[PDB]
From Swiss-Prot, chain B:
Family, similarity comment: Belongs to the fosfomycin resistance protein family. FosB subfamily.
Role of this protein: Metallothiol transferase which confers resistance to fosfomycin by catalyzing the addition of a thiol cofactor to fosfomycin. L-cysteine is probably the physiological thiol donor.
Enzyme Commission code(s) on record: 2.5.1.-
PROSITE patterns: VOC
Protein's recorded name: Metallothiol transferase FosB
One Gene Ontology term, aspect cellular component: cytoplasm
Species in which this protein is naturally found: Staphylococcus aureus (strain N315)
GO molecular-function terms, A-Z: magnesium ion binding; transferase activity, transferring alkyl or aryl (other than methyl) groups
SUBUNIT field: Homodimer.
Gene: fosB
VOC domain sequence ranges: 5-105
Amino acid sequence: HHMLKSINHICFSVRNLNDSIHFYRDILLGKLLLTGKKTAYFELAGLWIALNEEKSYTHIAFTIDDSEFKYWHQRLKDNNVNILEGRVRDIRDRQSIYFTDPDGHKLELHTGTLENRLNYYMTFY
Amino acid sequence: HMLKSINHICFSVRNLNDSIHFYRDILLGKLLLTGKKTAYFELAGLWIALNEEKDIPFSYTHIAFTIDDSEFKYWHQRLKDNNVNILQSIYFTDPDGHKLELHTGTLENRLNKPHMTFY
């Protein structure tokens, strides 16, 4: 009875499929499921990601465990990923990493949940 | 070592009151918090965060949501009767032009074009 059920997928336009495959599948450890001539699909963090090749007003955040924070931070740096600054102590307190994919779509890894944010936090409903 | 799940999606929006009505009332999401400048929703099991930026000027991304196939007509009519920008499947935008879709089957089903390479 009358609800959107779940996320079906997200889709990004990208300049170079092979570069984006390396990013989403090798660096971020997603699974490549299918390709076409100008198309690739992945499963990542339980989500389906579609890339369509086409040669700051949105971001997508994935959850990671606290205990994997330094693993991720270093994997992104070792792979020369473009890392962006977050809030003061986001790195030292293992809260968030912000970064872009090869085309500049903004991504984040976060160790908290929505309730954590709500509790840490204005008008509450 | 795996990313465990999606955490949330953040959208810039020109007018927070319009976006709240779009997300909470048209799409039937749950409003959790406001401040600012900001609103948080739970919609389709996903945290959505809106940040109001009143001087915004949208083609290179979309988020798609799954609906009951028996509800296709319900949703299609709901969006039409609410003057939503509309472009099996419904393709539409929010008040700021963020690209959204509704589909009545999972991307995995859909994928199940001989020339494509399946892994």
